[PDB]
């Protein structure tokens, strides 16, 4: 059952790090989208 405990800890930290990673690219992508929208807005005001 020690191997089973190793497995369960394995998937819990694996899914936690996947969640952290995915929120990282989500937030950086939303920042990049905001930057592109601002660039378009300032280009329209030129």
């Amino acid at each position: 059952q020690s191997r089973e405990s190793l497995i369960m800890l394995l998937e819990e930290q694996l899914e936690y790090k996947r969640g952290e990673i995915r929120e990282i690219e989500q937030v950086c992508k939303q920042v990049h989208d905001k930057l592109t929208s601002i660039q378009d807005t300032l280009r329209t005001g030129s």
Binding site: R3, E4, L10, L14, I21, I24, E25, C28
Partner: protein, 70 residues
């Protein structure tokens, strides 16, 4: 009946532990590559971040020396 439905629901209840051994080994492998990929991801994110910082500084300097040009 909860005893029966819990005893048969143990992953690995009907799976031999040695293929758990290979799956765990390859899990740590693909883990090694996934933090590696996160290393390149974070380093290029920081690269674009201080590109953004450099353009911020240039734009701020332009504003400052333009509004003090008169």
């Amino acid at each position: 009946r909860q005893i029966n439905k819990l005893i048969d629901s143990l992953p690995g209840v009907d799976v031999s532990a040695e293929e758990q051994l290979r799956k765990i080994d390859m899990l740590q492998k693909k883990l090694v590559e996934v933090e590696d990929e996160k290393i390149e991801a974070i380093k290029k994110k920081e690269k674009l971040l201080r590109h953004v910082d450099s353009l911020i500084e240039d734009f701020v300097d332009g504003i400052a020396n333009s509004k003090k040009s008169t």
